[PDB]
Amino acid sequence: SGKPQYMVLVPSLLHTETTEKGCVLLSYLNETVTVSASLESVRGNRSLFTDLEAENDVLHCVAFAVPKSSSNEEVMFLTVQVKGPTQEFKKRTTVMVKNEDSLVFVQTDKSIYKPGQTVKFRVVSMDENFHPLNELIPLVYIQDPKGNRIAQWQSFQLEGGLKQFSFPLSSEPFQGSYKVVVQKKSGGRTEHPFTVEEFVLPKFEVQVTVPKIITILEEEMNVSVCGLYTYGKPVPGHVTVSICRKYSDASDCHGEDSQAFCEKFSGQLNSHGCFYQQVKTKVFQLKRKEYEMKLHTEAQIQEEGTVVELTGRQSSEITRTITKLSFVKVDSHFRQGIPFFGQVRLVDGKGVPIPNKVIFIRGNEANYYSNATTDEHGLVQFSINTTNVMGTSLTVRVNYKDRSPCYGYQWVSEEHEEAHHTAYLVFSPSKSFVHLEPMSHELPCGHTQTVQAHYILNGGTLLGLKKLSFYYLIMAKGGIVRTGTHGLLVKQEDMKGHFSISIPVKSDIAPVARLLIYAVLPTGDVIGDSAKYDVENCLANKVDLSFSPSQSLPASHAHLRVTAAPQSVCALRAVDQSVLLMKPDAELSASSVYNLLPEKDLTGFPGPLNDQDNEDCINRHNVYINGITYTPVSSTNEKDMYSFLEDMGLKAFTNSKIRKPKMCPQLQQYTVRKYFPETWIWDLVVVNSAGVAEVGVTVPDTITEWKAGAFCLSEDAGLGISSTASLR
Amino acid sequence: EDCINRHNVYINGITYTPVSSTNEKDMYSFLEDMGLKAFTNSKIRKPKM
Amino acid sequence: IYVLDYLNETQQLTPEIKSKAIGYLNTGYQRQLNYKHYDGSYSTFGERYGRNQGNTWLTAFVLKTFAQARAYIFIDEAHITQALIWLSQRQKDNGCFRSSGSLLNNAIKGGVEDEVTLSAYITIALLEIPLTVTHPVVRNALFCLESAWKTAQEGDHGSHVYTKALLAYAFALAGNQDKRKEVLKSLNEEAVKKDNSVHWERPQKPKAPVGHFYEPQAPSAEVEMTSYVLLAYLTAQPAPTSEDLTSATNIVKWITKQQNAQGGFSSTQDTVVALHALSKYGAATFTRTGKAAQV
Amino acid sequence: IYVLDYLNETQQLTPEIKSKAIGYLNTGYQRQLNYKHYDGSYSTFGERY
C-alpha cells in the first residue's frame, strides 16, 4: 500500500519563443487523478497552463514550446496541484527566464588586403536548438580601427541560415585590422574581430623543438630545426639565436638591470636536410629565484640575406612541485554502505609515467592506509572499505609527509605533486541508497556503456509492493534528450548491487552528458543519484570533407564532395591558407561555436532567487536519549536530493521526505590565363541527395594549401560544421 | 578495556548525531560510595567507549 | 510618507514642507537601499556571508513602505518583486508564512507569534499590491485564514483582539459582506459602548502575563484594534451605505476622544494605522473642492 | 549626472537606465546630505566641534 509518489524533471529556465523539455511521473495505488502545471508570472500574469494525465511508471518527457514573453528578465510561478483522495497537495516555485540571442560567427575571406580591395564575409544565425535559423537584424556594420560603423543593412531577411555580404575597402590605406558588431531586435550587441594587415611575407618560417614542461632536476635541453621554403622546399642558411634568462636580481624598475643572462646560439643548415643544436640551463641560471622564462629562435638564409624569427615558450616555468601526477577516477560522494574504490594516475614532470616508484595510499579518517607502486602507466587502483565518518580527505603520495619532504618549509616550498581529494558520503538514513559507478575516462562516441550501478534496499520491503522500476536518462545538450528505465521486482530484504545499464552515445548528443537514476519508496522516501560525463564533441549531423585530390587535369571539373543530406544548404568556402599560415588560426572551429554557447550547461541559479524554504527543525530537541547509549541531538551536514535538484538545475514537487530535517539554531550566535587567388568559390550551396556534385574553378601550380570551408544546414536534421581540407 | 567506538558520529535515522557523556553516578559507583570493590561477570560499569 | 498621504488628502499642504519632506523621504529611501539583501529581503543582517537570513514582519513593513514610495516617489519594481519571490520562498510545504526570528528587539512586533497571523498581515498587504483574490499565494493564505477563522469562531477564545481583528480585516478585503456583518455582530457584543461615557477596552489584564508590571512587550493596541476594524469598516467600492458610514463617524468621534494630539504616540504600529484611518477617512467623509453650502 | 545630461541631449536614453540612474542619483545626493555642514560648506570634516 503506497501513497502516490510523483516526481518531475522539469527545468527551471523558461525561455521565450522556443522549445525545451521537462519530465514527470507518478506511482503507488491509485493513478486516476489529474495533475496540472500552471506556469504563471510572479508579477502580473502570463498564462501558460499545462494539464497532464497519465498512469504510473509512465514518464512521458516531451519537449514543450514556449512563446515569447513580455519583459526582459523575471521569474514566474509554477503551481502544480496534486489531489489525493484522502488529502490535497499543491506546490509552486519560481521559474526564471533568460534573455536569449541568436548565435553568430563571421567567416573571414582573408586577413591581408591592398588599397582598393573589397572584403567578403559571412555570418551565422542559430539558437540553442541547432536547427538553422532565419531572422532579421536591425544592427550590422563593419568597424574602422577608430570605432566607426562601416557596412550596414537593416533588418534583413536572412533566409539561408546565414547571409554573406561584402564591403568595398578603400584605396586609402588607413592601416589596421577591423571589426564587426551585431544585435537583434532585443538589442544585445556581439562582435567578431578579424585581422586585416599588410606586409610582404617572410617567404619561409622556422620550425623548432624544445622541452615542453620544465621542472626542478634539469641540466640540458634540446633543440632541433629544419629548413623550409614555399611548397615545403629545403634551404641552407645561418642563425644567431639569442635565448636568454631575464629578471635580473635588482628591483630593475629601470633604475637597474632588467636583462638577465643572454645566451646566443648559431649554426648552419645543409641545403637539403636539417640541423640540430643543444643547450643547457645552468648558464641560463635555472635559479630558485627568478621570474618566467622566454625561449625564442631565429634563422637567416643564404644568397639573399634575410632572417625569419620565432618566439617560443615565453614562460618555461619550473613548478613549486616536482611531479605531475593527479587523479583519473576520483569521486566526491559515497556511502558507508558501500566500499568505494577508484584509480589514480602517477606522472612525473614532463608528462611521463615511469614504473617502479613505490608509494603510499593514505586515507585519513578512514582508518585506511595502504601502499602501491607504479605500473608502466603509473596507475594504481586503490579501494577503500568504508564504515567511517561523514567527510574525509584522500591523498596518495610517494614521499612521506611527517615533515613536509623538504623539512618544514618555514621558507619557500617544493614538494611532490600530491593528488588530494575530499569526498563526503551520501546522507541516507534508511541506507537504502542508489549507487552508480561512473566510467570517468576518455569518453568515446558511437557506443553504449555498461555502467554497473548498484541498488541498495536496507530495511527492504515491509508491506510495500513487489513490482519496482527505475528511470535512467540519456541526456545532453544542456537540456533533456532521451530516457529509459529498468524494472526489477523486490524481494523482502535483499539489496543486491548487481545491475548494469545501457547508455548509448550515438547521435543528437553534445559534449555535455549528465544523467540521473532514482528509486521511490511508498513509505514517503525516494532516492536518486546523478553523474556528469565528459563527453567530447562527436558531431550530431554528419559533415565530412572530401576533395578532388592533388590532381592533374586542373580544369574546373574537380568535384570536391562533402557529405550532406537531400534536405540542406551549405556555406562553401574555397580559400588559400596563406596568411592563416603566416600566423596560426583563431579557433576557426566548432569549438568556438560550442564555447560561444550561452548557458551550455543547465546548472546554477542566479543570486536573487535562492530556494524554496520549508519547516523541519524541532522545537524542543534536547538529548532525550537513553538505553544502550546516551547521545545528544547535534547535527550533520551532507548532501540532499534537494541538492541533486539544485545541482541539475531542474526543479520538482513531491509530498515525500527529501529535504533533510536540519534543526534550526538559537539566536545566541557568533600569355597565361591565371585566375583569382584565395577564393575559387564563395557561395551558399544546396546539397543534392548525393552531397555536393561540384565543379569549382581549379588551377595548377598554386603552390599553396587551400582550406575548404563548408558548413551545412539541414531542416530535417539541423546544423553542420565540417572540417576543412587543403587542396593542391 | 571496553570500547563501543563507532568512527562516525554514527546515529542513523531522523537525525545524525555523535556520541556524548552523561552526568550521573552508576552501580559501579555504588561500590565507590561504599568505597569497597568487587570482581564480576555481570555488567555494572557504564559503557564508556 | 503616511503623513504626506494624510496632508495630500486633507487638502492641507505647502510646497516647502513638501520640499523638506521629499528630502527626508529620499534620505530614508537611500538609507534603506544601503540595507538591501542579496536575495531581496530586509532585516538587521550581517550579509556578505552566505549563511545569513532576513526577516518576515519587518519585510512586510518595508514592502508597504515601498508601496507608499511608489505612491509618491521613485522606487524599483524589481525590488518589490524580489520581496514577493522571497515571500513565496518563505512558505511551508503546505502551510503559510512562518516566523524566521533574527530580530534585535521584539518590542516592535504587535502579534501573537503565529505563522497564520504573519501570513494574514503580509497577504492583505499583498492584497493592496495589485493581484487577484485567487492568487496561489493569497489562496494558501486564505486557507490559513479560514482555519484561523473556524478556530476562533467555534472556539470561545481566539486571543480576543488581534487574530480576530486581522481576520475580519482580511476576509473583509477578500470580498465577504455578510460574514463581516457577522463579525461586526460578534465584536459589538464584545463592546463597551456606554450611553453617557466614552471608552473602549475590557479590563486590560492579559491571559499570559509577562512581567506583570507595565505590561512589557505589549503595546496593548488600544486604539489600534478599533482603528483596524474601522479601516475595514469604511470600505465599499461603488459606495458605502449610510449606517456604516455614520457609525464610522461616531466611532471616529470616540477614538479621537481616546487619542491625543501632542504629535506622535508612544509607538509606531498604532501610530501608522491610526494615520491610515485618519487619512482615508478624511478623504472619504468629504470632497476636496465643494466648499459652499447652506444646510 | 553629467552623463545623464549627455544622454538626455544625445536623444539616446531609456527609461530603465533612467530608473537605475535616478536611484544612484538619489543615493549620491542623500550620502552628500549626510556630509553637510553647520554653516553650509562641504569637506572631509570632523564637525560638531
Ligand SMILES: *[C@@H]1O[C@H](CO)[C@@H](O[C@@H]2O[C@H](CO)[C@@H](O[C@@H]3O[C@H](CO[C@H]4O[C@H](CO)[C@@H](O)[C@H](O)[C@@H]4O)[C@@H](O)[C@H](O)[C@@H]3O)[C@H](O)[C@H]2NC(C)=O)[C@H](O)[C@H]1NC(C)=O
Ligand atoms: C608497503 O609496501 C611494501 C611494498 O611491497 C610492502 O613491503 C613489504 O614489507 C614486508 C615486511 O615484513 C616484507 O616482508 C619480509 O619478510 C621477510 C621475512 O621476515 C620475517 O620476519 C620478519 C621479522 O620478524 C617480519 O618482519 C616479516 O614479516 C617476516 O615474518 C624478511 O626477510 C624481509 O626483510 C621482510 O620483512 C615484504 O617483503 C615487503 N615487500 C616488498 C619489500 O616488496 C608492504 O607489504 C606494504 N605495507 C604493508 C601492508 O605491510
Ligand SMILES: *[C@@H]1O[C@H](CO)[C@@H](O[C@@H]2O[C@H](CO)[C@@H](O)[C@H](O)[C@H]2NC(C)=O)[C@H](O)[C@H]1NC(C)=O
Ligand atoms: C494578465 O494576463 C492577461 C492575458 O494575457 C492580460 O490581458 C491582455 O491580454 C492580451 C491577449 O488577449 C495580451 O496580448 C495583452 O498583453 C494583455 N494586456 C492587456 C493589453 O491588457 C493582462 O493585462 C494581464 N494583467 C497583468 C499584466 O497583471
Ligand SMILES: *[C@@H]1O[C@H](CO)[C@@H](O)[C@H](O)[C@H]1NC(C)=O
Ligand atoms: C485510491 O486507492 C484505493 C485503494 O487503496 C482505491 O480503492 C481508490 O479507488 C483509489 N482512489 C481513486 C480515485 O481511484
Ligand SMILES: *[C@@H]1O[C@H](CO)[C@@H](O)[C@H](O)[C@H]1NC(C)=O
Ligand atoms: C635532441 O638533440 C639532438 C641534437 O640536438 C637531436 O638529434 C634530437 O633529434 C633531439 N630530440 C630528441 C627527442 O632526441
Ligand SMILES: *[C@@H]1O[C@H](CO)[C@@H](O)[C@H](O)[C@H]1NC(C)=O
Ligand atoms: C571491507 O573490510 C571490512 C573489514 O575492515 C569488512 O568487514 C568488509 O566486509 C569489507 N567490505 C567488503 C564487502 O569487501
Ligand SMILES: *[C@@H]1O[C@H](CO)[C@@H](O)[C@H](O)[C@H]1NC(C)=O
Ligand atoms: C494628492 O491628492 C490628489 C487629489 O486631490 C491626487 O490626485 C494626488 O495623486 C495626490 N498626490 C499624491 C498621491 O502624490
Ligand SMILES: *[C@@H]1O[C@H](CO)[C@@H](O)[C@H](O)[C@H]1NC(C)=O
Ligand atoms: C532633455 O532634453 C529635452 C529636450 O530634448 C529637454 O527639454 C529636457 O529638459 C531634458 N531633460 C532634462 C534636462 O531633465
